[PDB]
Write a protein that binds this ligand. Structure first.
Ligand SMILES: [Zn+2]
Lengths: 89, 95
């Protein structure tokens, strides 16, 4: 019954909260599993996702060769076909 | 060294549109943070949602997940507002 209470504030909550600000806390409370945090944080809108990856790349570039290597590592783990594409295998 | 500290990144520039189309950044920012090339601020910047319509959807999805955990999710959610959204915490608690 505690959640049915908050329903009246749903639009205010969904309007103010940036979820990535509180999912790390909620995950540590063990009320969000990794499949949960994925659905919340993923970007199915291509326009939005492109922007965010662009910002990520911009941040990594400022770290120089270190960020480049770490970025390639992440692709080999998580986006293997992309990794081969951009590294020419 | 056709990927030295100065030039490695310019090398990827030709693949930028494809990288930005395929990668879901939340799948790799945890890794990159563990590689120590992303600091917590950086990751908040990448993952944040400046578009209201998008942000609303995500919070709604988050609320539905949390509700499925019952009173434990309610208590955790409220604690997270108290810490990170104190004015919203006041609002929903009547204060
Ligand atoms: Zn309850």
């Amino acid at each position: 019954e505690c959640w049915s209470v908050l329903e009246g504030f749903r639009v205010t909550l969904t309007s103010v909260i940036d979820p990535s600000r509180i999912t790390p806390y909620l995950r540590q409370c063990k009320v969000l599993n990794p499949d949960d945090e994925e659905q919340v944080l993923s970007d199915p809108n291509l326009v939005i996702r492109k922007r965010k990856v662009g910002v990520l790349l911009d941040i990594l570039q400022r770290t120089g060769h270190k960020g480049y290597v770490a970025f390639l590592e992440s692709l080999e783990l998580y986006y293997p076909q992309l990794y081969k594409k951009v590294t020419g295998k």
